[PDB]
Amino acid sequence: XXXXXGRXXXXXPXXXXTXXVTXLXXXXXRXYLRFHXXXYXXXXXXX
Amino acid sequence: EVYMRYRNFMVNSYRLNPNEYFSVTTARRNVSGDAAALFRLHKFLTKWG
């Protein structure tokens, strides 16, 4: 019906500023250290 | 020239139905190009109304 010259345009529904736009194509119209290895009792203990 | 086309596509396809949120997903789907560039352009467009 609406198809024009081999083009299948059929599958279409047919029934501030106020600009006007064209329809169908819109455009303007833990762990804490332990004592060892912490450097005491490694220089100490006079007993 | 391609910038103008990106922008026109987005704005026109939004104005076809102004109460439907235009998402960057459809822009990414239809238009070829870097996705983050389209993302930034979409965000800029949303900024200026």
UniProtKB/Swiss-Prot annotation, chain B:
It comes from Saccharomyces cerevisiae (strain ATCC 204508 / S288c). The chain holds residues 341 to 389 of 825 of the full protein. Changing K43D: Loss of DNA-binding. Involved in transcriptional activation. Component of the SWI/SNF complex, an ATP-dependent chromatin-remodeling complex, which is required for the positive and negative regulation of gene expression of a large number of genes. It changes chromatin structure by altering DNA-histone contacts within a nucleosome, leading eventually to a change in nucleosome position, thus facilitating or repressing binding of gene-specific transcription factors. Transmembrane segments: none annotated. This is SWI/SNF complex subunit SWI3. Interacts with RTT102, SWP82 and the N-terminus of SNF2. Component of the SWI/SNF global transcription activator complex. The 1.14 MDa SWI/SNF complex is composed of 11 different subunits: one copy each of SWI1, SNF2/SWI2, SNF5, SNF12/SWP73, ARP7/SWP61, ARP9/SWP59; two copies each of SWI3, SNF6, SNF11, SWP82; and three copies of TAF14/SWP29. It is found in: Nucleus. Disulfide bonds: none annotated. Present with 3150 molecules/cell in log phase SD medium.
